[PDB]
């Protein structure tokens, strides 16, 4: 019985899968092609676990999950036995996304809850949490993705149809908002920064209004460029939008039971692939 898992994540080396469903449990699997052997079940949430997410193995085996109970739960495998080492629930509503930073930033976490907040939880020397939060969106935040870089930034997708790009500032000590972008007529479900250290940067912003805008910024200066992936509404509401590391392929999880794939061509416009 597992009729509706909401999220699954793969580890750096892809040996250990972590699905999370609505029955609150987070199941860990030892994958091996056809055979993912169930190795664990983790019960510690008071509502459907929306998302799970491993951290960089530089930090051992850590997994921050966020669930409907408004609480972010950090887990850790310890000698082959899992244990909830920390927790961070400074959010007064259902926590939706949770995504670790680039490991060069430390062990930073990115939480994004319906109380219009998004936190960046550091784990200090005592391993204890150091929350520095910001208000992100009015009617709630559905997602928040990290950006790689070599001047840190992230993106957030809102319930007010916004897509925001925040940046760290030593003057403020809290992430200062630097640019917001408007293009959807309904809850911005998911937002994704692309890991392509190439000439430009790409953002795929899927939404409830069955659109997927792509914000391509020329460089550090010139603002973004709006590009409706295709100019027809998808047969059903879109949920997830993920970039590929090698290649800059875009995967779109629409509520129409297939996942589409879009690649950029020399026109600059995007074309299906599969």
């Amino acid at each position: 019985h597992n009729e509706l898992i909401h999220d699954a994540v793969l580890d750096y080396y892809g040996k250990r899968l972590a699905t999370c469903s609505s029955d609150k449990t987070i199941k860990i699997f030892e994958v091996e092609g056809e055979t993912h052997k169930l190795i664990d079940t983790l019960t510690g949430h008071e509502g459907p676990v929306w998302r799970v997410d491993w951290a960089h193995p530089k930090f051992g085996t850590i997994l921050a999950s966020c669930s409907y109970d408004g609480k972010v739960l950090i887990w850790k495998e310890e000698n082959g036995r899992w244990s909830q080492i920390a927790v961070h629930a400074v959010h007064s509503a259902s926590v939706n996304s949770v995504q670790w930073a680039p490991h060069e930033y430390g062990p930073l976490l990115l939480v994004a809850s319906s109380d219009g907040k998004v936190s960046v939880v550091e784990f200090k020397e005592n391993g204890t949490t150091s929350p520095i939060i910001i208000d992100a969106h009015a009617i709630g935040v559905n997602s928040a993705s990290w950006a790689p870089a070599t001047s840190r930034k992230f993106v957030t997708g809102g319930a007010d149809n916004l897509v925001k790009i925040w940046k760290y500032n030593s003057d403020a000590q809290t992430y200062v908002l630097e640019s917001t972008l408007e293009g959807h007529s309904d809850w911005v479900r998911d937002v994704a920064w692309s890991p392509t250290v190439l000439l430009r940067s790409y953002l795929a912003s899927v939404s409830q209004d069955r659109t997927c805008i792509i914000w391509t910024q020329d460089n550090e200066q010139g603002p973004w460029k709006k590009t409706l992936l295709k100019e027809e509404k998808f047969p059903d509401v879109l949920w997830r939008a993920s970039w590929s590391l090698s290649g800059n392929v875009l995967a779109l999880s629409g509520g129409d039971n297939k996942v589409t794939l879009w690649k950029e061509n020399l026109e600059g416009k995007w074309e299906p692939a599969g």
């Binding site: 909401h6 892809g14 993912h36 190439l198 020399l266 692939a273």
Partner: protein, 503 residues
């Protein structure tokens, strides 16, 4: 509701209520369709053809010499496949010819090399058009037409023979000139044609065609074979330009270009594309870019191989950015095919040092395990993968699976924690000395053997959990062993139970 993101090992997990986990490990459909790529022997022999030098802006490998030729791939393909035709024709036009016999001066050499190349190209075209024309000769009902068709197969001798046999003797003699570029004969043939095409009550339809061939400009003309556009493969007519056409006066390139200027080729046809890139000479890249946005006849792999050959043979010129673009694209396709060694090899042909560094690093660390199996995987990590990167990656794989020599080559404290024998300790101390945290060093020095300072240092380290307690217990045991009055009391100032028993 559905969910799907991209894997580290670029592949896709989606909601799937048919498995066991509630997700599906999908092997991403690879555009990379070319068999020999999945066989590791090809890759080994391909690395044998390269000279790798470290960069002048970082230690990461990038290619200094390549001897790859379109020629080389041909062994791994069927001589029957259209692919083989593409690679072969590409070899004929682009791979350098060698001329073994010594030549009086070097401009001569150049001329010979041109003749050789020309002869191979035209023999090949004849290989292709062969059956088309033979079919046409099968169906002709007129001898002079057959003579013409034999000229279409660049067979001057059988044209001459049939002429002879069909009692067309003068023509026969004339025919013998086809392929000597005698300008006298050229202007004479053209003259005869104008005289006919000004009065000339009637001339046989195929004799005029043959004269037009002798004219050296069979479409470029006023009795033009251009209308044969509708009766013959474009390649067949191009053969006519190349064989007759004005061989000596033109370079192979500008000749081919001359022909192409008279006829549009189908956008989708790739052997067409190769001729266009060959003829385009002065702006191959320009055309290549044009070809890119118009068709997909040239695949990712081919475009990369082409660009690389031309680059490393001086044959042609491509932007650092276009060569890198091609290289990225192919490396990516390869990585989608779980061909990490091969993607790694390709990634080295990057010009941009920064990007090479990132790509390489990222991939090696993410995929170290698979890249350390056979010797064909060894030569791989003996591309010039930086010592640092390899062991570093390997260090990561150990922390995550739960090493020390690599570390010797915070984290160090955690390693000491895990270690918590005497010989190993001594070796560690020697390594630390070579490298030259301080507290731990003081403790080690004490163990090998001021005492109060070492004690304070150790206490501070303990404060900075299980390993620290173990170290504290060890220190206590050592102190107890040493004891076996005021100074002793000063040094002193389950563990609690032990302390109580001591008091």
């Amino acid at each position: 509701y559905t969910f799907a993101k991209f894997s580290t090992g670029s592949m896709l997990l989606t909601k799937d209520i048919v498995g066991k986990s509630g997700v599906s490990i999908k092997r991403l459909p690879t555009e990379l369709q070319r068999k020999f790529l999945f066989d590791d022997v090809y890759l080994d022999k391909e690395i044998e053809k390269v000279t790798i030098e470290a960069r002048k802006s970082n230690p990461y490998p990038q290619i200094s010499e390549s001897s790859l030729l379109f020629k080389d791939a041909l062994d791994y393909m069927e001589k029957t496949s259209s692919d083989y035709n593409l690679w072969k024709l590409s070899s004929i036009l682009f791979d350098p010819v060698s001329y073994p016999y010594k030549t009086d001066n070097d401009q001569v050499k150049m001329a010979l090399l041109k003749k050789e190349r020309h002869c191979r190209l035209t023999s090949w075209i004849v290989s292709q058009i062969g059956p088309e024309i033979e079919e046409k000769i099968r169906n002709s009902s007129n001898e002079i037409e057959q003579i013409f068709l034999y000229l279409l197969l660049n067979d001057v001798v059988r044209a001459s023979k049939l002429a002879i046999e069909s009692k067309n003797g003068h023509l026969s003699v004339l025919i013998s000139y086809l392929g000597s570029n005698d300008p006298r004969i050229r202007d004479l043939a053209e003259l005869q044609l104008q005289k006919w095409s000004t009065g000339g009550c009637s001339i046989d339809k195929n004799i005029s065609k043959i004269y037009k061939l002798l004219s050296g400009s069979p479409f470029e003309g006023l009795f033009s074979l251009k209308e044969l556009e509708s009766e013959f493969s474009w390649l067949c007519l191009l053969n006519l330009t190349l064989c007759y056409g004005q061989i000596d006066e033109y370079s192979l390139e500008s000749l081919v270009q001359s022909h192409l200027d008279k006829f549009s080729l189908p956008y989708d046809d790739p052997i067409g594309v190769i001729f266009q890139l060959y003829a385009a000479n002065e702006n191959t890249e320009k055309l290549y870019k044009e070809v890119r946005q118009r068709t997909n006849a040239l695949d990712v792999q081919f475009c990369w191989y082409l660009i690389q050959t031309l680059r490393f043979n001086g044959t042609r010129v491509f932007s650092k950015e276009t060569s890198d673009e091609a290289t990225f694209a192919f490396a990516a396709q390869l990585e989608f095919a779980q061909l990490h060694g091969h993607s790694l090899f390709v990634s080295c042909f990057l010009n941009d040092d920064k990007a090479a560094e990132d790509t390489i690093k990222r991939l090696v660390m993410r995929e170290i395990t698979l890249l350390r199996a056979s010797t064909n995987d060894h030569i791989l990590n003996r591309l010039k993968i930086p010592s640092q990167l390899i062991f570093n990656a390997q260090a990561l794989k150990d922390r995550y699976e739960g090493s020390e020599v690599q570390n010797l080559l915070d984290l160090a404290e955690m390693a000491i924690v895990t270690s918590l024998v005497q010989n190993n300790e001594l070796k560690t101390l020697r390594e630390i000395l070579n490298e030259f945290v301080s507290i731990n060093v003081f403790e080690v020095y004490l163990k090998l053997v001021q005492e109060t300072i070492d004690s304070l240092i150790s206490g501070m380290k303990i404060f900075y959990v299980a390993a620290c307690c173990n170290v504290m217990s060890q220190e206590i045991v050592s102190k107890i062993l040493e004891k076996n009055k005021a100074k002793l009391l000063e040094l002193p100032l389950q563990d609690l139970m032990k302390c109580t028993y001591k008091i």
